[PDB]
Enzyme design. Structure first.
Site, PDB file in Angstrom:
ATOM      1  N   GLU A  35      53.416 -56.833 -54.636  1.00 34.16           N
ATOM      2  CA  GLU A  35      53.301 -56.118 -56.097  1.00 34.16           C
ATOM      3  C   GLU A  35      51.624 -56.014 -56.534  1.00 34.16           C
ATOM      4  O   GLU A  35      51.176 -54.985 -56.886  1.00 34.16           O
ATOM      5  CB  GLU A  35      54.081 -56.546 -57.133  1.00 34.16           C
ATOM      6  CG  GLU A  35      55.534 -56.211 -57.349  1.00 34.16           C
ATOM      7  CD  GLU A  35      55.783 -54.855 -57.333  1.00 34.16           C
ATOM      8  OE1 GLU A  35      55.117 -54.078 -57.405  1.00 34.16           O
ATOM      9  OE2 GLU A  35      56.996 -54.499 -57.210  1.00 34.16           O
ATOM     10  N   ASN A  46      51.325 -44.557 -63.815  1.00 35.44           N
ATOM     11  CA  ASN A  46      52.438 -43.550 -63.356  1.00 35.44           C
ATOM     12  C   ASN A  46      52.329 -42.360 -63.880  1.00 35.44           C
ATOM     13  O   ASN A  46      52.825 -41.974 -65.153  1.00 35.44           O
ATOM     14  CB  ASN A  46      53.870 -43.979 -63.336  1.00 35.44           C
ATOM     15  CG  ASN A  46      53.905 -45.428 -62.616  1.00 35.44           C
ATOM     16  OD1 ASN A  46      53.761 -45.646 -61.476  1.00 35.44           O
ATOM     17  ND2 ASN A  46      54.240 -46.597 -63.497  1.00 35.44           N
ATOM     18  N   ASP A  49      55.786 -40.373 -65.169  1.00 36.30           N
ATOM     19  CA  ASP A  49      56.284 -40.677 -66.506  1.00 36.30           C
ATOM     20  C   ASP A  49      55.720 -41.340 -67.557  1.00 36.30           C
ATOM     21  O   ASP A  49      56.364 -41.706 -68.589  1.00 36.30           O
ATOM     22  CB  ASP A  49      57.650 -41.418 -66.307  1.00 36.30           C
ATOM     23  CG  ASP A  49      57.372 -43.139 -66.149  1.00 36.30           C
ATOM     24  OD1 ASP A  49      56.405 -43.392 -65.294  1.00 36.30           O
ATOM     25  OD2 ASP A  49      58.181 -43.850 -66.238  1.00 36.30           O
ATOM     26  N   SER A  51      53.965 -44.125 -67.475  1.00 36.60           N
ATOM     27  CA  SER A  51      54.117 -45.464 -67.844  1.00 36.60           C
ATOM     28  C   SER A  51      53.216 -46.287 -66.983  1.00 36.60           C
ATOM     29  O   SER A  51      52.585 -45.575 -66.147  1.00 36.60           O
ATOM     30  CB  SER A  51      55.808 -46.038 -67.559  1.00 36.60           C
ATOM     31  OG  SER A  51      55.997 -45.697 -66.057  1.00 36.60           O
ATOM     32  N   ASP A  53      52.222 -49.933 -64.846  1.00 37.79           N
ATOM     33  CA  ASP A  53      52.975 -51.340 -64.215  1.00 37.79           C
ATOM     34  C   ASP A  53      51.501 -52.298 -64.517  1.00 37.79           C
ATOM     35  O   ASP A  53      50.523 -52.320 -64.327  1.00 37.79           O
ATOM     36  CB  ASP A  53      53.059 -51.148 -62.840  1.00 37.79           C
ATOM     37  CG  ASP A  53      54.277 -50.147 -62.641  1.00 37.79           C
ATOM     38  OD1 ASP A  53      55.272 -50.170 -63.225  1.00 37.79           O
ATOM     39  OD2 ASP A  53      54.012 -49.166 -61.665  1.00 37.79           O
ATOM     40  N   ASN A  60      56.707 -52.758 -65.539  1.00 39.98           N
ATOM     41  CA  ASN A  60      56.471 -51.302 -66.102  1.00 39.98           C
ATOM     42  C   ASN A  60      56.745 -51.337 -67.796  1.00 39.98           C
ATOM     43  O   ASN A  60      57.758 -51.948 -68.472  1.00 39.98           O
ATOM     44  CB  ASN A  60      57.431 -50.467 -65.518  1.00 39.98           C
ATOM     45  CG  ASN A  60      57.399 -48.701 -65.720  1.00 39.98           C
ATOM     46  OD1 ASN A  60      57.953 -48.515 -66.727  1.00 39.98           O
ATOM     47  ND2 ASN A  60      56.552 -48.297 -65.196  1.00 39.98           N
TER      48      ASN A  60
END
Ligand code: NA
Length: 130
Positions: A35, A46, A49, A51, A53, A60
């Protein structure tokens, strides 16, 4: 903070992650590794959308934490996404535990499925004294 492998393994063990909801410490290590490369300040936006992380587990903002800039998002971990960027990972661990207390468990993270599921993860905790 970018953790050294074994340093992280003991950190997560002290935080009660070893076997949490049946997930071994090695699985958590494999997750953090893929990750964020064990980097607590890792972020990924992102564009699709809107959002983001956050942190060592790349959690998220659409569902888990609040950053005030993700449209219609919720905050299941009841944390500011800032808490997921701290050098101290206690809050990130509390949130990751919250994430796996859902239907999919550790499978919630696509990266775990791609690079940890049905693979050798013991290597991540070997020699760490855990
Ligand atoms: Na959110």
């Amino acid at each position: 903070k970018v953790f050294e492998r074994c340093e992280l393994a003991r950190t997560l063990k002290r935080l009660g992650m070893d076997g949490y909801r049946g997930i071994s410490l090695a699985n958590w290590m494999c997750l953090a590794k893929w990750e964020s490369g064990y980097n607590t300040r890792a972020t990924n936006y992102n564009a699709g959308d809107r959002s983001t992380d956050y942190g060592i587990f790349q959690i998220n903002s659409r569902y888990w934490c609040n950053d005030g800039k993700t449209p219609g998002a919720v905050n299941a971990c009841h944390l500011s996404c800032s808490a997921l960027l701290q050098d101290n990972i206690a809050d990130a661990v509390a949130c990751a535990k919250r994430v796996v207390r859902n239907p999919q468990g550790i499978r919630a993270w696509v990266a775990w499925r791609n690079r940890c599921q049905n693979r050798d993860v013991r290597q991540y905790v070997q020699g760490c004294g855990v």
